Amino acid sequence: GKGDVAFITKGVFLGLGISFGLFGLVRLLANPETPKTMNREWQLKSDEYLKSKNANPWGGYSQVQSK
Amino acid sequence: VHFKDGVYENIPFKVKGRKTPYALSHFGFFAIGFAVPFVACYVQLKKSGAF
Amino acid sequence: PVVKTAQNLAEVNGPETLIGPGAKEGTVPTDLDQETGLARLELLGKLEGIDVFDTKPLDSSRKGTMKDPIIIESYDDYRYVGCTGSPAGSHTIMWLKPTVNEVARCWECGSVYKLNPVGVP
Amino acid sequence: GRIGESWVITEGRRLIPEIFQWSAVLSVCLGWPGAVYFFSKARKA
Amino acid sequence: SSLPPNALKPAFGPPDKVAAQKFKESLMATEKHAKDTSNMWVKISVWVALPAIALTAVNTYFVEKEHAEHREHLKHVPDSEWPRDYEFMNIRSKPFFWGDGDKTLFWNPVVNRHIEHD
Amino acid sequence: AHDEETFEEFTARYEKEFDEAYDLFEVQRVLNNCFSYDLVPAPAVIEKALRAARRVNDLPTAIRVFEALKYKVENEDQYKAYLDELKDVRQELGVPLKEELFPS
Amino acid sequence: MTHLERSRHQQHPFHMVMPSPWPIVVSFALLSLALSTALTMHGYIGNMNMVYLALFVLLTSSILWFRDIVAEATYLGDHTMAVRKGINLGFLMFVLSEVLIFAGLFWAYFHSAMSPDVTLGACWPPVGIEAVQPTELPLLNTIILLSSGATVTYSHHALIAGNRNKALSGLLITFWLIVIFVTCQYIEYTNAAFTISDGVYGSVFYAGTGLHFLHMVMLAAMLGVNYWRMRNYHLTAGHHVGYETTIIYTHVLDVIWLFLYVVFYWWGV
Amino acid sequence: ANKVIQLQKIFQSSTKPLWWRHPRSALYLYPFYAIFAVAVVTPLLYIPNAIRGIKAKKA
Amino acid sequence: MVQRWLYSTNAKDIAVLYFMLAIFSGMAGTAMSLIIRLELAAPGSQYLHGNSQLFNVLVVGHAVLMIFFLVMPALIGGFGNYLLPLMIGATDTAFPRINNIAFWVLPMGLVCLVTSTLVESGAGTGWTVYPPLSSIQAHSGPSVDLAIFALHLTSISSLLGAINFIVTTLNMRTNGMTMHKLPLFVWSIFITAFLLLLSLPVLSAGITMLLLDRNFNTSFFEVSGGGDPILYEHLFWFFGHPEVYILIIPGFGIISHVVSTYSKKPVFGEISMVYAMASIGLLGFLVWSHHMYIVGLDADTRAYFTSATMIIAIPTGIKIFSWLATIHGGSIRLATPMLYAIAFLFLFTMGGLTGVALANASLDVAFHDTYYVVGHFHYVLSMGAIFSLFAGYYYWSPQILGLNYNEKLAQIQFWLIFIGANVIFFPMHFLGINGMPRRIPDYPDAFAGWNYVASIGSFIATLSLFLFIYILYDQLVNGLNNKVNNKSVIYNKAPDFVESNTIFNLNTVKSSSIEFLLTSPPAVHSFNTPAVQS
Ligand code: HEA
Ligand code: HEA
Ligand SMILES: [Cu+2]
Ligand SMILES: [Mg+2]
Ligand SMILES: [Zn+2]
Prior knowledge:
Chain C: GO terms for molecular function: oxidoreductase activity; zinc ion binding. This is part of a larger assembly, with nine protein chains of nine kinds. Chain E is mainly α.
């Protein structure tokens, strides 16, 4: 009744934003260092090694996934 | 003896007539419920490594 | 004070009259001798002919509306009645709560239920 | 029916706008992995 | 104290149903049939069960005397002459928490020796 | 009866069920049990429903017949060719519709 | 009769039990037993004194519970015929759950027996293990259960009949008959060539026969309680549900013993 | 010894609860309360000794 | 008050305590799910640094705590104890001390399960606690002994509740309840209580065989010594599939009742639906080794089991078709338990379709111990049993508790748990078919995206439970004000079309079972007199 569909979609999107922010500031305190084979410079060598031995030839074989 | 019935005499919590607010007991129940795996993690992380 | 032990169902006077006499030194006890309380009440009833705790599905022969209702009996002020049509299984089971001060109308069958509340509280 | 607009038209008018919104709600109840893959660095973003 | 007018009216109807009186008279038929079928079963017991127990008792006394003289034969065997037996026999994953460590509940020290592998 | 009900047995059973009602609960109950079936009832049923709502002397259940029927029918050509069949009963009984009563 | 003295009763045949403190105490004792027997199996506490007192407090709380139920069943007098059929069906379902534990043990025996492993010598019974022959002592303590069943059924049918000197004699001799069974079963255990650790054969054999052993010592305790309350005039001629319970239990224990005995002593040797 | 109706006349006619209603029921429940309190409070002082990992002093 | 909550042989005041331990343990289990999915969010050793044994302890704690201490209490124990006497007209249940000891031996299983995760690092095996992973050579300590003593105690509790339920709906029915006239939740609790005492004896036998070959030197599954660990897989999964059918059948009953009462229509063919449910019960024993297609069974017995699990699949299909038939043509009033009932159909049909993708013994060689399996059971267990649990609470607790909740907060809680739990378990299928195994602390960093997406979803699924906790608080301190001040919905069954408001106030509740005719919080002796029925 009387615009409570607007209130419940406001509550849903506010809950998504609140959980996103709290996941971010929980993610902030996890661990300082990464495993060293996570940046793109390792990934280019790790899929050059793959195309040396033609693994996953028709599907996807390129692994980068890092900025 | 038939125990007398009401709207707040069906649950073990006393809600209306107290000295402390009800939010203390109601959120401390789930605080200890949510913090028993954290104290398990702490007693397991001081036994092997650090923390 | 003076108490006899209710030879059949007519002379019960509460929970102090269902005791009965004990067995002798050699005979095995029969259930008429030693059984007491509610079990003795049911045994004395079944030996008289009746059985207490009258379990029976209610009369759904006639429909019955506010000129002459369906009269139900209860020892309390309310009795939950599950109506299932003017035959025994016409429409699905709808539960009504006839009480002492209000009749219960079915809304799918249409029948009404009214108490004669026995009570004695 | 017998007299009126025909049942084929009067139920096509009711259901043909429903197919597109069904396709929308199914394409966003199963297709959000495409939307999360689209922005990541695996698609050379 | 102001009884409602439905107080002293009756509550149960006609108390002379033939069903419950024939129930009460079948309460004699069950007792008569029990007095027959207990005499029958005690004759079954004292004729059938007791001679079978006596014959099985003399059989088990004969072979229990044979097993007793065999256990007295394997009493005096020196323990290194007991045969080295297999991997599944006498497993010990963890020691038993009661006793010395190698002793079960009904561990007979004559028929169940732990060889300790010479 | 779990065997099916033909249309003539339907309209005869419900005409003899609208004739017998005396209270208001009975009229609304048998009206709900007539409308919550699968078919829409022929006007031989519904003019008798209007008379049975007149016998109890209350108005708005002699209007919600018409609005429940407008929800029942498949288009509005069926509704107009229906409503010109119950014209004079609506005239001398003096009940209104919804769209002219609440203009919106 | 009068409505005024009809509304002074239960109004339905079922039991309304007053609040009794013997779920909470026996649950406390079960927790203490579980933790103390998980704690003494690794040498954390010194002796078995504490698992002994935990088992003892469980036993005495449950026998106080059975004291409360015999007082409520025959003194306060609530066990009418509806409640009697209820507790009868409840005991039937409980024993149907016990025979499925026995079926799980028989599944273990069959699975490791009819497909024998290559470390047992690929033969059932395994090499070296002198199996128990079924004809010496197993024949006595498989005929003694049939004789026990015959005498407990004539003691039952003499209890229904009316004589006391026969219905008591049958119960006394079935108690001494099955305790003679239990003692010769312990005699069979204390001179046998294999222990519970000697291979998988001794393991599943002693598991099955020891579970039946504990079941019939619990039956002997049940029958001792039933003989005591038959001597003290509690058992009637038509309200003996706590005795029909134990004769159902001893007859199904007899048939599960014959199943266990056949496939543990004839086919498995 | 046919003492069931006297026990019934005693057990119906009291206010005390059922596990306290017998005459000789004082000898059955006081030592039970003592040994039960002891037997259930006693592993909860051995559980932190197990959490710390320190075993027994046996042998 | 000590005799009303500690002795308390009354089936209404035992169910509240069942529900209190249920919400406590469900909070603990979802804290463990949050810690697991928070550590699996990124490759490399996160929040718990190294220490894979701690992760194994956390995942067995999450699995066994949330199965045997949330879903089984809050579906069998709590809901059956409150409603099975209150639908068939018994004043309360038969054997009342038995379902008091069932409740009171639950939380001691809980406290020994909690203290099993502290001593000598801990039991890590997963909830399917296997040998020789759990034998004394490869796993030393008193940890897994307490961890399976918890299963002994929970096993005893559920069997005592099963015998209680079976006899209390086989004898103490009301005056007119015939053998087939009961409401369908009574039939679900009936058949579930049969499957308990037909199944869990085998479980307790197998796990006490595990205990006495851990500590009592026997050789049931110690393989160098005669035994075999395949016998434990048989003896465990013979319970392990009937256990989840036990956990899901009262869910079917709850969903049947709420879609019957929120669409103003009886369920389409209740007799065929209860025949399908009973055949599901008596058929769920014959397919116990569909979890063992890999271990080395013959192709012939694998062919038998992949034949029989599809005949397991068909009556669940006709149940879902009858649910679509009974919500078709209704007058659907979209309140907050009807929303959960509508979501349960889709979110369980999805998991059942991927389950019959798993059920092919051909196809199970590419999917076993793989996150595809997690995506299947965290649909049909999580969304299934707990959307039915939420559609049980939001539908029954205004009648039980007598305090009406807030409505808009209930709908944002439903949409938050729906979105934030659909985003977790849907990338688990892609992780499965790409090749991720189960129970790893973390993984080779190829599939580094879907774990991050699932971890950003688990925080939404936890925040919705925090909002459910606030819904419980707002119901407990603002019940009467939500009755009065127009924040809630008051009538779950709306008045029909041609019925007046003055005529709706005569027949307020148009129920079909007894429970919505008793007053809010009901009397402690509700049926003084029997409740007649024709
Ligand atoms: C009861 C069943 C159940 C449920 C609901 C869940 C739900 C969740 N589980 Fe899972 N899980 C298992 C049982 C379950 N799980 C099992 C058996 C395994 C296998 C273990 C193994 O094989 O090793 C497993 C494995 C498992 C994995 C795979 C790890 C691996 O093996 O490699 C993960 C990873 O995300 C996980 C985490 C979670 C999380 C974050 C949720 C979240 O969905 C949690 C959020 C849930 C809620 C918010 C529900 C509401 C909670 C309430 C308390 C409501 C109260 C209401 C009433 C009482 C009416 N658990
Ligand atoms: C709640 C308990 C529960 C339920 C109900 C189910 C439901 C089903 N499950 Fe599941 N399952 C588990 C609990 C459950 N499962 C657990 C705990 C695991 C992990 C165990 C572990 O640790 O290894 C698991 C994993 C698992 C495995 C083990 C795979 C492996 O580990 O290697 C298998 C194998 O067959 C399986 C198949 C099925 C099938 C066919 C159904 C069916 O019952 C589903 C029925 C539903 C439908 C079929 C959909 C609705 C029907 C229609 C829409 C009609 C049309 C459909 C057809 C024509 C098919 N699932
Ligand atoms: Cu399964
Ligand atoms: Mg596996
Ligand atoms: Zn009716």
